[PDB]
Amino acid sequence: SQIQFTRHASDVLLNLNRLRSRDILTDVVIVVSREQFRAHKTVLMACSGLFYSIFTDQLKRNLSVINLDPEINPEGFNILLDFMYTSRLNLREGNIMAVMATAMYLQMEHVVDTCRKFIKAS
Amino acid sequence: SQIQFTRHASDVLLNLNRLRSRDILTDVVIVVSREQFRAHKTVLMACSGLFYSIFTDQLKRNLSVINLDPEINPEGFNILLDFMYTSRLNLREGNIMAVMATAMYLQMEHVVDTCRKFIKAS
Ligand SMILES: C[C@H]1COCCN1c1cc(NC(=O)Cn2cc(-c3cc(Cl)c(O)c(C(N)=O)c3)c3c(=O)n(C)cnc32)c(Cl)cn1
Ligand SMILES: C[C@H]1COCCN1c1cc(NC(=O)Cn2cc(-c3cc(Cl)c(O)c(C(N)=O)c3)c3c(=O)n(C)cnc32)c(Cl)cn1
C-alpha cells in the first residue's frame, strides 16, 4: 500500500554512474588484459553472477583488484560495465560475439539471451 | 541507439536492498538517537543531498559512523532508508509529519514535495 516512485530506481543508477565517473567510493579495479576499470563492488554484485559469487565469499570480499580471464575482450567488458551502470547495451555487428562471450563469462543471462535475439534478427 | 533494458535499474536496486538485508559490503552505520542502521554510502549519496554533501568531502568520505541530529525520528529515518532501497514510500497520517521533517533534513526534495501532496489530499 506504499507510494511508488516510478523514476527513483533509474535516478539512483544515474547517480551511481555519476559517482563512478568521478571515482567516488569505487572500491575495486577490474583488470582485463592491458586495461583497468574502477567500479563499485555492490553494483558489480548486483549485475553479475561472477562478481556476486566472488564478493559474497568472505575469502575474496575485500579484494581491491580482480584479474579477469586473459581471453576476455576489454571492449566487450567495457560495454557490459556501461550497461550495468546505465541499463543501455551498445550491441553492434562488430561487437556482438565479444559482448555475448563476455556476458556468458560474467554470468549475465538476460544479456546473453538478448545477444541471441540480436543474432536471430541478423 | 543502444538497446534499453526497462527492468535493469529496478532489479539492481532490489539486489542492493538484498545486499543491505545480509549486511554485505555495508560501509557505514547511521545512528539516529537510540537506533542504528547499516547502509551503503553510495546508495545514501545517490538518494540524499545531506549524505551526498558529507561523503563527497574527502574530509568525511571514510567516516564509518554518522550521527544524525538528535531531533530526527528513528522511524521517520527508517521509512526513508527503506524508500531509498525500494522506490516505495510508507506515508500514513500517523507518520507524515516525521517523514516530511526527516526528508527535509536529508535533503530529498521530491519526497518532501510528495509529502506536501499527501497533506493537501488529507
Ligand atoms: C540470489 C538472489 C535470489 O534470492 C535473493 C538473493 N538474490 C540476490 C542476488 C544478487 N545478485 C545476483 O543475482 C547477481 N546477478 C545479477 C544478474 C543480472 C542482474 C541484472 Cl539487474 C541484469 O539486468 C542482468 C542481465 N540483463 O543480464 C543480470 C545475474 C544473472 O543474470 N545471473 C545469471 C546470475 N547472477 C546474476 C544480489 Cl547482489 C543480492 N541478492
Ligand atoms: C550533482 C548532480 C548533478 O550533476 C551531475 C552530478 N550529480 C550527482 C548527484 C548525486 N547525488 C545527489 O544528487 C543527491 N541527491 C539525491 C536526491 C534524490 C534522489 C532520488 Cl533518486 C530521489 O528519488 C529523491 C527524492 N524522491 O526525493 C531525491 C537529492 C535531492 O532531492 N536533493 C534536493 C539534493 N540532493 C539529492 C550523485 Cl550521487 C552523483 N551525481
Measured in degrees and rounded to the nearest 5, phi and psi for residue A40 equal -100, 130
Q: Bin B23: left if φ > 0, else alpha if -120 < ψ < 50, else beta.
A: left
Cell of B37: 542502521
The CA distance from B55 to A54, in Å, is: 27
CA distances to B4, B31, B32, B105 from A86, in Å: 9, 32, 33, 29
CA nearest neighbour of B68 among B86, B82, B50, B83: B50
Is the distance from CB of A13 to CB of A86 less than 8 angstroms?
Answer: yes
| Approach to solving | X-ray
Cell of B6: 526497462
The CA distance from B99 to B111, in Å, is: 9
Helix H or strand E segment including A39: strand A35-39
- How many whole angstroms from its chain centre is CA B53? 14
* CB contact set of B121 (below 8 Å; sequence gap of 6+): none
* CB contact set of B6 (below 8 Å; sequence gap of 6+): A87
CA distances to A3, A47, A64, B113 from B68, in Å: 25, 32, 30, 22
Residues 49-68 on A with a CB inside 8 Å of B are 55-56, 61
The CA distance from A38 to A27, in Å, is: 7
The CA distance from B51 to A107, in Å, is: 33
The CA distance from B18 to A65, in Å, is: 24
Please judge whether B83 and A25 are an interchain contact, meaning their C-beta atoms are less than 8 angstroms apart.
no
CA distances to B38, B62, B89 from B67, in Å: 12, 14, 23
Query: Which DSSP string do the residues of B64-113 spell out, in sequence order?
Result: SEEEPPTTS-HHHHHHHHHHHHHSEE---TTTHHHHHHHHHHHT-HHHHH
CA of B40: which chain A residue's CA is closest? A42
3-state secondary structure of A70: coil
Cell of B11: 532489479
Q: Across the strands, what pairs with A35?
A: A32
B46 Cα: distance to centroid of ligand 2 (angstroms): 6
Helix H or strand E segment including B35: strand B35-39
Domain boundaries of chain B, sorted by first residue: 1-122
The shortest C-alpha distance from A10 to chain B (Å) reads 5
Judged on CB neighbours under 10 Å (0-12, 13-18, 19+), A75 is middle
